[PDB]
Structure formats: structure tokens, C-alpha cells
Design an enzyme around this catalytic site. Structure first.
Site, mmCIF file in Angstrom:
data_model
loop_
_atom_site.group_PDB
_atom_site.id
_atom_site.type_symbol
_atom_site.label_atom_id
_atom_site.label_comp_id
_atom_site.label_asym_id
_atom_site.label_seq_id
_atom_site.Cartn_x
_atom_site.Cartn_y
_atom_site.Cartn_z
ATOM 1 N N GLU A 295 25.755 31.668 38.884
ATOM 2 C CA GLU A 295 26.362 32.982 38.750
ATOM 3 C C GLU A 295 25.324 34.038 38.429
ATOM 4 O OE1 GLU A 295 29.135 33.891 39.567
ATOM 5 O OE2 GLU A 295 30.504 32.212 39.458
ATOM 6 N N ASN B 261 31.838 43.927 43.515
ATOM 7 C CA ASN B 261 32.703 43.310 44.510
ATOM 8 C C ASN B 261 33.182 44.356 45.501
ATOM 9 O OD1 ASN B 261 33.748 41.474 41.623
ATOM 10 N ND2 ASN B 261 32.234 40.869 43.145
ATOM 11 N N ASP C 166 36.105 45.082 46.350
ATOM 12 C CA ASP C 166 37.305 45.721 45.835
ATOM 13 C C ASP C 166 37.013 46.734 44.722
ATOM 14 O OD1 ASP C 166 36.885 44.048 43.567
ATOM 15 O OD2 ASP C 166 38.827 43.060 43.743
ATOM 16 N N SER D 223 35.702 46.178 41.794
ATOM 17 C CA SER D 223 35.500 45.529 40.504
ATOM 18 C C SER D 223 34.028 45.121 40.391
ATOM 19 C CB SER D 223 36.350 44.283 40.249
ATOM 20 O OG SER D 223 36.056 43.255 41.200
ATOM 21 N N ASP E 71 31.281 42.200 38.380
ATOM 22 C CA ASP E 71 31.075 40.953 37.626
ATOM 23 C C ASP E 71 29.908 41.173 36.661
ATOM 24 O OD1 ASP E 71 32.973 39.676 39.331
ATOM 25 O OD2 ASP E 71 31.393 38.792 40.569
ATOM 26 N N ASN F 15 34.652 39.086 35.607
ATOM 27 C CA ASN F 15 35.099 40.189 36.443
ATOM 28 C C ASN F 15 35.988 41.207 35.739
ATOM 29 O OD1 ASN F 15 37.360 40.979 38.848
ATOM 30 N ND2 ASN F 15 35.157 41.257 39.296
HETATM 31 AU AU AU3 Z 1 33.800 48.021 38.527
#
Ligand code: AU3
Ligand code: AU3
Ligand code: AU3
Ligand code: AU3
Ligand code: AU3
Ligand code: AU3
Ligand code: AU3
Length: 129
Positions: free
Chosen positions: A35, A46, A48, A50, A52, A59
Site C-alpha cells: 500500500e 482515487n 472518484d 477520494s 488514500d 480511504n
Molecule cells: Au479526497
């Protein structure tokens, strides 16, 4: 902070992640390797919108607040920045919540695809624990 492999194993153990929800320490070290490459400051955007954050790339869609993920939740009740700290306490605490949520470590895509079913003990081999 960039952790060494055994150094992170030890930190995770101190904070009670070893065998948490039946997941041995090597599974947690493996997940952190793929990760974040053991870097607490790792971030990843991401598609979308979001983000991480941290050693286990937690997330913002569900687990932390970063102010910029519409419709999102903050189930660990922390700013996402807390997940980037040199001390892994917030990330471990949040990881325990995630891994309790129903699909176990499958919530971490990189664990499912690169750690699950492999010889995860290798990641703690040689470590003084
Ligand atoms: Au964000
Ligand atoms: Au193991
Ligand atoms: Au959020
Ligand atoms: Au905010
Ligand atoms: Au938000
Ligand atoms: Au906040
Ligand atoms: Au399980």
C-alpha cells in the site's frame, strides 16, 4: 517516516495489530509494503475524488475527514492528516475498525491481490519479536 520492515512489524505488534481479527503480523506488514512502501506520508488520489492516506492507505470515502470528499463519512473520527504521522497509532486504530467491517483484509485491494494466500510470514522473518 519510512519504516524498515522489522521496525514496522514491531510497531504494529506494540499497538496490538498482530493476530487482530485473526490476521497474523506478516499480513499487516505485507499490506503496508504494497500500500505505501512503508511510508507514513504516502497519499493516493482515487478517480472518484477520494484520497488514500498513510501506511495502510486508508480511504477518505468512509474512514477519515479530509474536507474534500463529498458525501463521504468519517467512521474513524479523525482528520485524514492524522494517518500521515510518524507514529502509527491513528492508522492502527482505524485499521482495526476497517478490518472488523465485514470483509476482513479484503478491504485493502493491494492485500487481496498481492498478499492473500502468499507466504506472508516472510515479511516478519528474521525480525526480533
Ligand atoms: Au479526497
Ligand atoms: Au506472519
Ligand atoms: Au471522509
Ligand atoms: Au474539514
Ligand atoms: Au468531506
Ligand atoms: Au477533521
Ligand atoms: Au476474516
Amino acid at each position: 517516516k519510512v519504516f524498515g520492515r522489522c521496525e514496522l512489524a514491531a510497531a504494529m505488534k506494540r499497538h496490538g495489530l498482530d493476530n487482530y481479527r485473526g490476521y497474523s503480523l506478516g499480513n499487516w506488514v505485507c499490506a503496508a509494503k504494497f500500500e505505501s512502501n512503508f511510508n507514513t506520508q504516502a497519499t493516493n488520489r482515487n478517480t472518484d475524488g477520494s484520497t488514500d492516506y498513510g501506511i495502510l492507505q486508508i480511504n477518505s470515502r468512509w474512514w477519515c475527514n479530509d474536507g474534500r470528499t463529498p458525501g463521504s463519512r468519517n467512521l474513524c473520527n479523525i482528520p485524514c492528516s492524522a494517518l500521515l504521522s510518524s507514529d502509527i497509532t491513528a492508522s492502527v486504530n482505524c485499521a482495526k475498525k476497517i478490518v472488523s467491517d465485514g470483509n476482513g483484509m479484503n478491504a485493502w485491494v493491494a492485500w487481496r491481490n498481492r498478499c492473500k494466500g502468499t507466504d506472508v510470514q516472510a515479511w516478519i522473518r528474521g525480525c526480533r519479536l
